[PDB]
Design a protein around this nucleic acid. Sequence first.
RNA 1: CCCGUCGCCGCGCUCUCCCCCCUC
RNA 2: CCCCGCGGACGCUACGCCGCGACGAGUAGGAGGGCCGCUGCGGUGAGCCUUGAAGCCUAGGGCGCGGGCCCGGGUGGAGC
Lengths: 53, 128, 125, 63, 109, 225, 240
Amino acid sequence: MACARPLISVYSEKGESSGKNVTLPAVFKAPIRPDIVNFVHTNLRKNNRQPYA
Amino acid sequence: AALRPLVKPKIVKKRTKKFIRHQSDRYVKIKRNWRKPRGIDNRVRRRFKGQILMPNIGYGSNKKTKHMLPSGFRKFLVHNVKELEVLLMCNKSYCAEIAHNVSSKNRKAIVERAAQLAIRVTNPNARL
Amino acid sequence: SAHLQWMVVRNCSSFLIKRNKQTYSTEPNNLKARNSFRYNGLIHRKTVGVEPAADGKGVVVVIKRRSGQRKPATSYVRTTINKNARATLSSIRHMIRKNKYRPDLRMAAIRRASAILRSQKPVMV
Amino acid sequence: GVDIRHNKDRKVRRKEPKSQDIYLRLLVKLYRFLARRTNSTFNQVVLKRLFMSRTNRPPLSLS
Amino acid sequence: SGRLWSKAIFAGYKRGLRNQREHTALLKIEGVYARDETEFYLGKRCAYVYKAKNNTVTPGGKPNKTRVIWGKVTRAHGNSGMVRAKFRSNLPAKAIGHRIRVMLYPSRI
Amino acid sequence: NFAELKIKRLRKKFAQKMLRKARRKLIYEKAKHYHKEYRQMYRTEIRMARMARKAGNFYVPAEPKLAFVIRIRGINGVSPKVRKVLQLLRLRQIFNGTFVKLNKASINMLRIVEPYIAWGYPNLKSVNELIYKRGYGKINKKRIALTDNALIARSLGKYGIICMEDLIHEIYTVGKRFKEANNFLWPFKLSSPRGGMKKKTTHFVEGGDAGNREDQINRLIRRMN
Amino acid sequence: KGKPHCSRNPVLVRGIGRYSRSAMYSRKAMYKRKYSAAKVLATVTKPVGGDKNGGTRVVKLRKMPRYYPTEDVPRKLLSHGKKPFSQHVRKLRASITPGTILIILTGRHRGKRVVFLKQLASGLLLVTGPLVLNRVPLRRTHQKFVIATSTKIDISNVKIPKHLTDAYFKKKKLRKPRHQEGEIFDTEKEKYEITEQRKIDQKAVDSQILPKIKAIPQLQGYLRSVFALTNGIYPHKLVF
RNA sequence: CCCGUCGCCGCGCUCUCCCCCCUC
RNA sequence: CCCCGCGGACGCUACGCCGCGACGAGUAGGAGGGCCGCUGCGGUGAGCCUUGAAGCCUAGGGCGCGGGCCCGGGUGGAGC
Ligand SMILES: [Mg+2]
Ligand SMILES: [Mg+2]
Ligand SMILES: [Mg+2]
Ligand SMILES: [Mg+2]
Ligand SMILES: [Mg+2]
Ligand SMILES: [Mg+2]
Ligand SMILES: [Mg+2]
Ligand SMILES: [Mg+2]
Ligand SMILES: [Mg+2]
């Protein structure tokens, strides 16, 4: 499945296929790691915080 | 008249009374909510005879009849009709009940839908 | 893949209801509405769901087609059965069993269709 | 009462990975089934290694 | 037309010196003062009959103030003709020194 | 091919049935032979004593080779050596019984734990009732009731012991595989003696219960199970 | 097919026959009885009838369910005992034999002394302390709740009618067949009526029981009186 | 396919024919 | 080569479900689990709410070994 790389149609502003296709970027077959995403999200939401004392 | 559960076993409660806190009788500042005694000389903790009993795992209910209402069902809290339809395939084991903050006009519709779906409601006449 | 997506949504999903020591899952094509790998209505290449008809009579049997897995607009074929109860159950049984289309959901779909039809017949006094 | 000691009753060992990695847990499911349903001891060793921590799974060099 | 039940006295609960097992009771049956005489009464139904304030339904009759706790003799107690009895609900402690009836109902003679 | 596989399954099941019947017949005949052996031993002792008395001499019977040991005291305040010997005898609870093959090594262990045990020489009826009413096997480290001969045959079949009769024989006559059969037996969990004890803190010969009572252990066993 | 034979193995103790395997083999002559080797229509066809309506229809009996409950109950395991009550064995106390005088202990005939006739198929005793003596008709009673006295009469050669069975003595009732909401009273028919058949049978049995009762002195007065516990007497000391 | 009266174990009868005793 | 029957319960949140055996004292102390509880943030519940939120009161109905929780009635008046 990872080696599979389909063609995704590009849709027009009217919502219909325009006949153009883009091969799926390989990033959409990257591993899905909810634990890593949670770790990065948890540690990156702390960075916009404003100090209180 | 009421909808009946799938099976109606005999519910055996090992203990029927609450576990009151030690000395919650002698004080108003001490609520009856159970707190484990940790005093060095506490006779309830040391389990002397005639004292307040301590909750432990041996009092646990039979897993077949745990969380089971006297009607034979198990309750599920619902806040609207959509949450009510999750019990469509659990008609004869789980009974819905409407949340306390659901308005009267909305709980009327929930009651009607539950009657249609043959779901038992533990508080069907609650705001009227 | 079904197992990979299940490892993602088994405890983190907007359809998840964890309450009263019970767990329910409310995605559209879930028979028995339980949080389970077998009955999840989203993660499988082929799913079957039974819903009440748009009007107050009949059932809608919706099955997932094979080709457009990533195209949710056309991924589901819905048919309406508005016959008597025995013929409706026979139709659903033949959709699931004869097609070999996910035969582990046959009795779940039959029982859900029975529940829907029984709810559609008028309430008693 | 019986005259036994209970300080060694609970055996301390990994029964599952402490990791929440879903791909690791998937292949743990696979090799759990393999270990249960085959007589091979290779599968059992591989499964118990999959449970292990990173310091118990040191890297292996090409040399 | 006649009594048809032996008179017994609710003597107390089955007990040690400082522990009390209220689930079973000791009865002194009149005229039974040896352990070898208690064989007749084993298994016999025994009732503690009392009166209360509210009326309760009477089987085969109109409601009256009479209530009853049923039980049966289970075994002999001691050497002096006392017997043990298990009632459906543990006998109230106000009944100590009061009348129990032993009804002969499940007779073996 | 349905008929062929049906015939194959029928032949397999018939072969299973024939093997089971052969095993049942073997068990039956082994039990009959053991009955013959038991009565021969019982009569031989009487005959030897009779001929000694006829000659005017004494027949001294063989010292008993089998003992039944019951732990009669509890687990509180036990000295370390007594504790270790009781664990080696597998008596870790009060009113736990076990069989002990008697020799110098085991007797000198019994002398250590004498205040804590009541032991003696079980007879055939005692062995029978202990195995049949309270016999459990240590099968895969579990205490499994001996409800089927297959349980005995799976664990002790390699020693020729394939039934309760074989087990009883191997215990009563000590035999060559006594260690295996006895350790296969989970220690017996007897009840409290019905009728009471005389005095558990003193020896039997001074009016108590501890120590060696030669053949009164059978009277004790009848009440403890 | 051959006609059935008796057991050919007498029961000396329950579960053990008198003869062994080989003895039974020879008694059955199994040496010459050796053998080496050698439904219900689900659907019915019916002529439906009608021009161009097809010839017939294969109508299946035993149609499939129209509705399925949301959940079911697993079936029970098999228990190898536990016969129904109609097939239970019936045990009667040795002291209770036909003609024995019994003391009823429960019911409206509490304390009355009646005559025992026979044990019915359900194990209930059939008694009639004759209706002219103590107002006890042909009635059923439970042997647990009677005291068997040592006084008896020889009621051998009296004929109990064959139709005096448990089905004969079973109670009759009929309520709310067409009646659903109880506001109009159904409290009629509560008066049980003595059937003339019951009167006929009572007279038939009494006409041959009473002459035997009058044979021995002051038995009729004994049957007329009721049993009571005097404050000095004790049932464990009483010989009944 | 109307609800596995099922496994192990112990038995009985028939697929052989005569008789004997009560009963229709 | 199943077919007069086209048919046949449940299950398997695999972090789930099932079976079998033994066991259960505990201060100081350690560990695990907590669908115990409080406040706030990111998501999510096409969540709840003036046809009545929070809070409080309650000889009301219950659940859990328990921490606690849910529901009824009242009061309250804007949020949870
Ligand atoms: Mg409680
Ligand atoms: Mg207080
Ligand atoms: Mg102290
Ligand atoms: Mg400890
Ligand atoms: Mg001591
Ligand atoms: Mg005694
Ligand atoms: Mg001492
Ligand atoms: Mg313990
Ligand atoms: Mg502890």
